[PDB]
Amino acid sequence: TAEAPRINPVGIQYLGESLQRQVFGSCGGKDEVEQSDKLMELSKKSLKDHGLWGKKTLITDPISFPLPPLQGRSLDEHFQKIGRFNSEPYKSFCEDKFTEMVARPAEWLRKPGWVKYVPGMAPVEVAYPDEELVVFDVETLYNVSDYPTLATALSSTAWYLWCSPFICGGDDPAALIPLNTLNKEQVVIGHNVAYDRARVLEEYNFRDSKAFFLDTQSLHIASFGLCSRQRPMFMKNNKKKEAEVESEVHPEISIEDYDDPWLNVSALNSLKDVAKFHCKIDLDKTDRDFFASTDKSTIIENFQKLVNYCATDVTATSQVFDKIFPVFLKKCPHPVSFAGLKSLSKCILPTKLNDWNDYLNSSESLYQQSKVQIESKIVQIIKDIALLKDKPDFYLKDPWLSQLDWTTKPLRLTKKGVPAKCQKLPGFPEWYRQLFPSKDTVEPKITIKSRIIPILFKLSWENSPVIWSKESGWCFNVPHEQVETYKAKNYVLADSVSQEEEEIRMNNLGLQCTGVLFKVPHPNGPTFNCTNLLTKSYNHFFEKGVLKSESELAHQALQINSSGSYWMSARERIQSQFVVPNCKFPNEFQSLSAKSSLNNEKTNDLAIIIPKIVPMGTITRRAVENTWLTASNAKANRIGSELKTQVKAPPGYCFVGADVDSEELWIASLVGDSIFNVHGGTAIGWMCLEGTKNEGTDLHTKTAQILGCSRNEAKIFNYGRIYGAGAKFASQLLKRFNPSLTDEETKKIANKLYENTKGKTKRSKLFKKFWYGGSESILFNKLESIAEQETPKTPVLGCGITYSLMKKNLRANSFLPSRINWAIQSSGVDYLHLLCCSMEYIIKKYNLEARLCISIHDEIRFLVSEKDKYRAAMALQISNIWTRAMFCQQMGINELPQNCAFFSQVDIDSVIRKEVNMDCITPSNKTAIPHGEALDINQLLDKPNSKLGKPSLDIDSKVSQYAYNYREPVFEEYNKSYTPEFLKYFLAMQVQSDKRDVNRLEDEYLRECTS
DNA sequence: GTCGT
DNA sequence: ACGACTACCCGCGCGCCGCAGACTGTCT
DNA sequence: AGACAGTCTGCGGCGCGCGGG
Ligand SMILES: Nc1ncnc2c1ncn2[C@H]1C[C@H](O)[C@@H](COP(=O)(O)OP(=O)(O)OP(=O)(O)O)O1
Ligand SMILES: *P(=O)(O)OC[C@@H]1CC[C@H](n2cc(C)c(=O)[nH]c2=O)O1
Ligand SMILES: [Mg+2]
């Protein structure tokens, strides 16, 4: 009756026969049986050492449902043909591009709209250029409005100029540039092209577009990338440039280029630096000042020079692209990369105008009131203190007040006249005078972040006033008889120089001296000093009675800081967004579906925001957004944290979204398990694959119960260990999570956890230094082994590394921890590209009404009508299983576990939030939001409308034309170098747990080598 | 790239 | 001089130091 | 009636801590 589960030697489930046939086809192995016997004995020893042999795992019923068929005999052929289908039209336009440039017109004309100039003929007026490929540039005035002012375009046969009606006679500055994007397929090349895309008229539609905007900055960051090592390497480049500019003679190859050949590899991302590095062109940026004016009559003059400057920028961009493009084509030869690059450039954000304005007003109105209410009282306190000038004894017999500078400057007297020498507050103490910046200032300036805040307040650490020392920071005084006693609680003595400084400071006031000075502890360590006392770290110490105040203002200050830090950080970015309403452009906001189907209300308000996304702005080739990839989540106390809830779907539509579970951990486990050619060969892989999230048995949750912390903190703890964190930092993090623990406990727990995870180290001559005896030793050794290759490539697709981080350019400096993370963090991007390609292929094939809305890292959302929601979820599941199967096949394994095949949850909602069940209550927002829906695979299958429907026959016919070429995987050519006996003896030494075993196996290997 | 034995 | 080291992004506020710039007071 | 040498008086760039994903 029921199908029997299929289980490999270790207790893990695989896919059913139906899914096996529909995904992997007919594949057989058993070629390496003789090697697999010895490998299985070694794996048996490794698993029995850690007590994981014969342990129970989760087993469920098989899952069977019909998938769409594949287009090849292997996954690689299928993905290549789909990528060629999806990137065929525009890539032919990218090649055969013109290399010669036509001449410029002698004189330009000021007419509203689009004017075409062809050399040898009279200029004409056109509605739109109607060209396959153009180079584009836009200029706007940013102090009057956000709308464009003029535009220039170049093609292979003519020049095009666009002029706004605002500068040709008129008072309405709202206008947009038309390009007929909804009907004509075209490629537009530019530098930071998203800013230019935001000013196009036909981009403000819910219906999809047919234009491809390409950026040269991403192409420069990918190949010939800037170092971007998050290192002083950026400072190193700047100081080299300063030194080279300073000295006419440049013997660079003599000293600094010999030690650091990386210096002459790349430059900065700006257009000036990129153009200067790639070509011998010098550009001028002065003319930008002409666009900083408020009046428009200045733009009427100097028309010719501004237009010529725009044309020069266009020419420079054209030459830069012509130089860069083939190198990027050589570095990334797979079509899926280009398809994903095209796909990641069409984001859109629906909003509403009035709600946006109300949200902004509420946030600002709360923030300013909260700031002013606490800033009012400190001035009164200062004015109360300031009347003690006449009597010295009060402030000379007080502990806190005696650390101020009370010296007064005498009144100057020029001969026979008033001084009038720009004096500031004559006959006043120095600390009072220092508050006022200028003569015009009448009210003192003070914030809660000023240095003298503890002195103005009365702050005590264990009933001892705080003292400021220039060398060490904040300190407190301990009597002699207890100096040893306070050393029992891990209090570090201050530096000696501070001791003499305190000695003379007291001696100037007499009072002899008692005790020594200890330092207030700092969370990062004993070496770092303390300079602030109202941060998050000292909030805990305000409770439990360690830090105490004689005034009621400190706790309020802590509340206000914690409530307003994020809004203070992000207010300028948030308030400057460009929002376009429906009232101004009544012929553009067209529905995604072809049929209108009414759904019209009494003048409803809608708006669209186009994000400024740079597709490839990282060495690991991730995307960059300054505002929308850094948005905070909703919190009860935090002000203005409901930003992402402002994205609302129009009536009759919804959002469908998904997020990937434990991506890089799974990738690392697969890389570790690839050696034994079995799932669960290593201990870490068996621990990772034995549980799943829906029953609360995943690795992060288990670490959370072992360490007694949250899952988010456990993620940081687990990733830090993998990416190279020491045991001391781990103990510091453990104390950070639980601040009521002693240092000794954290040290023993950290050492015990690190000993089990990583074994001892063995150093030899013929074999280099390696770890042994640990559960993850093989994974680590494989990480440095692949990091030390001559030509590193991503294991799945085969993308090369940037020239800055290559071995030959790095002579002395190494940057190893940045070289190790690169492969995993780039596979994380290959995953997203494959997902996007699969989803958009399915959307084209089955005629679904959907469009990509937003793509945060490892999280994707789509805007879908009411009818086709479950079909979109189904397509998401199919894309996920195809991507995982491709990753498994590229490593040399033709099997897939059942537990990790599908998404845990799929979210259907009307707004963007982390969880569908959140209420999103903030101090700014007093209204709850209704909950959404979340579904897993079985409940999705139970739905009646989950089925796809009938396909289109012509799509497969078009796809079948493209060609396929066989390529060898990268790990095979890596393995070609090493001899088999070397690998077997090395792994046999790695699986041992004792030094004598390693020595005797090394001796046997040496004897075999001699024999 | 940067800092201790 | 060798070995050990969480990784990739974004940005605001406060203290410090190097220079323009105005005010006299002899000095011519 | 200038010449110029001190003599203060701010103003701007830099860097590093401190927070968000
Ligand atoms: N401190 C960190 N250090 C290094 N990498 C991190 C760190 N935090 C997050 N990441 C990495 C790992 C992830 O691939 C990715 C973050 O995506 P994320 O979804 O939050 O983690 P996750 O997918 O493993 O958990 P979950 O299953 O809950 O989604 O970047
Ligand atoms: P936020 O919702 O917290 O994070 C979403 C994405 C996932 C990946 C990226 N990211 C976040 C954090 C906190 C990190 O340390 N590293 C990341 O890459 O932000
Ligand atoms: Mg995730």
Question: How many residues are listed for chain A in this entry?
Answer: 1011
Helix residue ranges, H only, A583-726: 663-673, 683-689, 699-707, 711-722
The region, left, alpha or beta by phi > 0 then psi within -120 to 50, assigned to residue A425 is: left
Identify whether A48 is part of a domain: no
The string of DSSP letters for A18-75 reads: HHHHHHH-S----TTHHHHHHHHHHHHHHHHHTT-TT-----------PPPPPSSSSH
The nucleotide whose C1' lies nearest the CA of A914 is D21
The region, left, alpha or beta by phi > 0 then psi within -120 to 50, assigned to residue A633 is: beta
Distant-in-sequence contacts of A16-20, Cβ < 8 A, 24+ apart: A16/A62, A16/A63, A16/A64, A16/A898, A18/A64, A19/A63, A19/A64, A19/A67
The CA distance from A207 to A588, in Å, is 10
- Residue A856 CB less than 6 A away from ligand 1: no
As given in the structure block, the two tokens for residue A378 are: 């400190």
What single-letter DSSP state applies at residue A132?
A: S
Domain count, chain A: 1
Helix residue ranges, H only, A690-761: 699-707, 711-722, 727-737, 743-757
Helix residue ranges, H only, A206-302: 216-222, 233-246, 256-259, 271-278, 297-300
For A104-122, letters b (16+ CB in 10 Å) and e give: beeebeeebbbbbbeeeee
What single-letter DSSP state applies at residue A902?
A: S
The CA distance from A689 to A663, in Å, is 13
What single-letter DSSP state applies at residue A801?
A: P
Are the C-beta atoms of residues A951 and A942 closer than 8 Å to each other? no
Nearest ligand by distance to the CA of A663: 1
Q: How many CB atoms lie under 10 A from the CB of residue A837?
A: 26
The CA distance from A66 to A64, in Å, is 7
Q: How many CB atoms lie under 10 A from the CB of residue A850?
A: 21
Give the 3-state DSSP-derived string for A467-515, with helices as H, strands as E and coil as C: EEECCCEEEEEECHHHHHHHHHHCCCECCHHHHHHHHHHHHCCCCCCCC
What single-letter DSSP state applies at residue A509?
A: T
As given in the structure block, the two tokens for residue A552 are: 């009621």
Q: How many CA atoms lie within 13 A of A119 on its CB side?
A: 10
As given in the structure block, the two tokens for residue A68 are: 């769409």
Q: How many CB atoms lie under 10 A from the CB of residue A825?
A: 18
Identify whether A857 is part of a domain: no
Are the C-beta atoms of residues A154 and A111 closer than 8 Å to each other? no
Are the C-beta atoms of residues A337 and A827 closer than 8 Å to each other? no
Nearest-CA residue relative to C1' of B2: A232
Q: Which residues contact A803 (CB under 8 A, 6 or more apart)?
A: A223, A224, A225, A265, A266, A809
As given in the structure block, the two tokens for residue A541 are: 């110490």
The CA distance from A810 to A372, in Å, is 54
Are the C-beta atoms of residues A605 and A354 closer than 8 Å to each other? yes
CATH number, domain at A140?
3.30.420.390
Task: Indicate if the alpha-carbon torsion angle A741, A747, A748, A751 is positive or negative.
Answer: positive
Identify whether A129 is part of a domain: yes
Pairing of the two strands A186-190 and A211-215: parallel
The string of DSSP letters for A145-174 reads: -SSEEEEEEE-SS-EEEEE-TTSSS-S---
Spatial distance from the CA of A522 to the C1' of C18 (Å): 33
> Which residue in the block uniquely carries the two structure tokens 């800081």?
A561
Q: Which residues of A are marked as active site?
A: 137
CA angle A693-A699-A701, nearest 5°? 65
The CA distance from A1011 to A998, in Å, is 20
Pairing of the two strands A148-154 and A133-140: antiparallel
- Residue A856 CB less than 6 A away from ligand 2: yes
Identify whether A204 is part of a domain: yes
Distant-in-sequence contacts of A524-531, Cβ < 8 A, 24+ apart: A524/A732, A525/A732, A526/A492, A529/A472, A529/A473, A530/A473, A530/A474, A531/A473, A531/A474
Secondary structure (3-state) at A815: coil
Beta-bridged to residue A7, according to DSSP, are A13
R_g of chain A, CA atoms, integer Å: 34
Task: Indicate if the alpha-carbon torsion angle A740, A744, A748, A753 is positive or negative.
Answer: positive
Task: Tell me, rounded to whole angstroms, the distance of Cα A264 from its chain centroid.
Answer: 28
Q: Where are the beta strands (DSSP E) in A345-480?
A: 349-351, 459-461, 467-469, 473-478
Helix residue ranges, H only, A847-909: 869-890
Beta-bridged to residue A148, according to DSSP, are A140
AA letter at A487: K
The CA distance from A519 to A450, in Å, is 20
Secondary structure (3-state) at A349: strand
The CA distance from A668 to A778, in Å, is 11
CA distances from residue A25 to A70, A73, A598, A874 in whole angstroms, order as listed: 10, 8, 48, 21
Task: Indicate if the alpha-carbon torsion angle A610, A614, A616, A621 is positive or negative.
Answer: negative
The CA distance from A128 to A134, in Å, is 12
The CA distance from A812 to A839, in Å, is 46
CA distances from residue A715 to A662, A683, A720, A721 in whole angstroms, order as listed: 10, 19, 8, 10
As given in the structure block, the two tokens for residue A258 are: 């010999």
Cβ neighbourhood burial of A870 (10 Å; 0-12, 13-18, 19+): buried
What's the gap in Å between A857 CA and the centre of ligand 3? 8
Spatial distance from the CA of A370 to the C1' of C10 (Å): 26
Beta-bridged to residue A493, according to DSSP, are A518
* Residue among A152, A163, A167, A154 nearest A310 (CA): A152
Pairing of the two strands A859-865 and A516-519: unpaired
Identify whether A385 is part of a domain: no
Task: Tell me, rounded to whole angstroms, the distance of Cα A819 from its chain centroid.
Answer: 18
- Residue A773 CB less than 6 A away from ligand 1: no
What's the gap in Å between A554 CA and the centre of ligand 3? 39
Secondary structure (3-state) at A13: strand
Are the C-beta atoms of residues A46 and A682 closer than 8 Å to each other? yes
Identify whether A175 is part of a domain: yes
Spatial distance from the CA of A625 to the C1' of D17 (Å): 24
The CA distance from A133 to A92, in Å, is 11
The CA distance from A348 to A206, in Å, is 8
What's the gap in Å between A660 CA and the centre of ligand 3? 4
What's the gap in Å between A833 CA and the centre of ligand 1? 18
Identify whether A858 is part of a domain: no
> Which residue in the block uniquely carries the two structure tokens 């963090």?
A825
Pairing of the two strands A516-519 and A547-549: unpaired
Q: Which residues contact A221 (CB under 8 A, 6 or more apart)?
A: A228, A269, A616, A617, A618, A619
> Which residue in the block uniquely carries the two structure tokens 């068929």?
A69
As given in the structure block, the two tokens for residue A507 are: 């001696």
Q: Which residues contact A156 (CB under 8 A, 6 or more apart)?
A: A97, A98, A102, A133
- Residue A374 CB less than 6 A away from ligand 2: no
Q: Which residues contact A969 (CB under 8 A, 6 or more apart)?
A: A795, A890, A892
Task: Tell me, rounded to whole angstroms, the distance of Cα A74 from its chain centroid.
Answer: 34
Task: Tell me, rounded to whole angstroms, the distance of Cα A809 from its chain centroid.
Answer: 27
Q: What is the position in ligand 2's atom list of the atom closest to the CA of A716?
A: 15
What's the gap in Å between A365 CA and the centre of ligand 3? 36
The nucleotide whose C1' lies nearest the CA of A262 is B1
What single-letter DSSP state applies at residue A177?
A: B
The CA distance from A981 to A400, in Å, is 75
Nearest-CA residue relative to C1' of C23: A421
Spatial distance from the CA of A387 to the C1' of D17 (Å): 35
Task: Tell me, rounded to whole angstroms, the distance of Cα A707 from its chain centroid.
Answer: 27
* Residue among A168, A158, A166, A174 nearest A109 (CA): A168
- Rounded to the nearest 10 degrees, how much is the dihedral formed by the CA atoms of A932, A938, A942, A947? 90
Beta-bridged to residue A162, according to DSSP, are A114, A151
Range of the structural domain that residue A128 is part of: 98-227+265-331
Q: Which residues contact A429 (CB under 8 A, 6 or more apart)?
A: A386, A389, A404, A405, A406, A407, A408
As given in the structure block, the two tokens for residue A146 are: 């956000």
Q: How many CA atoms lie within 13 A of A1000 on its CB side?
A: 6
Are the C-beta atoms of residues A895 and A680 closer than 8 Å to each other? no
Q: Where are the beta strands (DSSP E) in A914-974?
A: 933-935
Secondary structure (3-state) at A880: helix
CA distances from residue A939 to A762, A862, A863, A905 in whole angstroms, order as listed: 53, 20, 21, 10
* Residue among A803, A717, A813 nearest A231 (CA): A813
- Residue A698 CB less than 6 A away from ligand 1: no
- Residue A857 CB less than 6 A away from ligand 2: yes
Spatial distance from the CA of A450 to the C1' of C15 (Å): 10
The CA distance from A199 to A216, in Å, is 19
The CA distance from A643 to A62, in Å, is 42
**By 3-state DSSP, what share of chain A in percent is helix, strand and coil, each rounded to 5?**
45, 10, 45
The CA distance from A252 to A986, in Å, is 44
Beta-bridged to residue A211, according to DSSP, are A186
Identify whether A214 is part of a domain: yes
Nearest ligand by distance to the CA of A914: 2
